[PDB]
């Protein structure tokens, strides 16, 4: 027999993510060089990998949209809402969306593409918000980067630390 | 730091459900049996106890849905997914939903909803899927066509593994 896990997690450390569509904001190199370093900052620090898809079914499915767009946390226009993403899990778990309506950047203009999609993979995860101002998983947005302590030790206390070294 | 914590079992004993709505394929009183020796499956072997509820808000809501149904895991026609629930918890939690798509049944012509909502309350009550291959919670189903079911070991000792015995 199998009972539950006792939190939500990948029951896997190989997970793989689609970007689905690319914002107007930046280029489409720009966007994934965004991604793939926002992925290492928790593989970095975990057995975690990850494996980008061109196509097809991955567990993080990422997108830009605006207003509805297919689930029940519909995005607002510019401001307020940014981006949210599912914890682990089938169909819409893990997967991450980016409001449309905000400028998306690679820079410390508008939002910080890297910055937001590290923390919305925090979600993809298994990582809610922290109370600890410093965090990655703050709730709050503020503009090299270096994953907190808080933020390893949450992302460790689900997955392990895989290479120590 | 924060989680997601899920909850790893019913903290009471005394859980409810609710007949949402039916399926065309059985009568209200097939459907209701069907459900109500479902529960007892897992009733006879723990100290939980069923009640059902006609109004209102219940521990295990139990609705037939088809396609995109109110939860983004939409059902897919006939075949393929047949059923899912919810594992413990509040709101959704507990919830079985079945795809009024396939053809339930009292006996044999389809699935029969009994085995099918047995499995599913499993997973409303806190198991995942079995190995095993001869148990309940064993993904795959199958039809004795013997009249008495009876749970098999491994379903026994996982739902005991929670809430003891009866
Ligand atoms: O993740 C998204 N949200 O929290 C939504 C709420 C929806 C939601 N809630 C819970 C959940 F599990 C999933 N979705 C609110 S928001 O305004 O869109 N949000 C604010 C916080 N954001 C952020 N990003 C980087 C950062 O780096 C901090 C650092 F620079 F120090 F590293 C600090 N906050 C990202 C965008
Ligand atoms: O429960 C539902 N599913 O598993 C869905 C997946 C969605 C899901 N996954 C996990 C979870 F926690 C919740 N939901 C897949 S399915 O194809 O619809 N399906 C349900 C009915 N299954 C079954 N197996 C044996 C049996 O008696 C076996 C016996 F006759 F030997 F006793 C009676 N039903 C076969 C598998
Ligand atoms: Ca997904
Ligand atoms: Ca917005
Ligand atoms: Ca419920
Ligand atoms: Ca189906
Ligand atoms: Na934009
Ligand atoms: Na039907
Ligand atoms: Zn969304
Ligand atoms: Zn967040
Ligand atoms: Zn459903
Ligand atoms: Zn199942």
Redesign the interface.
């Known amino acids: 027999?199998?009972?539950?896990?006792?939190?939500?997690?990948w029951s896997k450390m190989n997970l793989t993510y689609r970007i689905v569509n690319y914002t107007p904001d930046m280029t489409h190199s720009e966007v994934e060089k965004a991604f793939k370093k926002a992925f290492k900052v928790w593989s970095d620090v975990t057995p975690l990998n990850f494996t980008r898809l061109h196509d097809g079914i991955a567990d993080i499915m990422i997108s830009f949209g605006i207003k509805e767009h297919?689930?029940?946390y519909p995005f607002d226009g510019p401001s307020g809402l940014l981006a949210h993403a599912f914890?682990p899990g089938?169909?819409?778990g893990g997967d991450a969306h980016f409001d449309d309506d905000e400028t998306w950047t690679s820079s410390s203009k508008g939002y910080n593409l890297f910055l937001v999609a590290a923390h919305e993979f925090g979600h993809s995860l298994?990582?809610?918000?922290?109370k600890?101002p410093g965090?990655l998983?703050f709730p709050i947005y503020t503009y090299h980067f270096m994953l907190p302590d808080?933020?390893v030790?949450?992302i460790q206390?689900?997955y392990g630390p895989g290479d120590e070294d």
């Open positions: 027999y199998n009972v539950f896990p006792r939190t939500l997690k297919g689930d029940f914890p089938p169909n819409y298994g990582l809610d918000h922290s600890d965090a998983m808080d933020d030790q949450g206390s689900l």
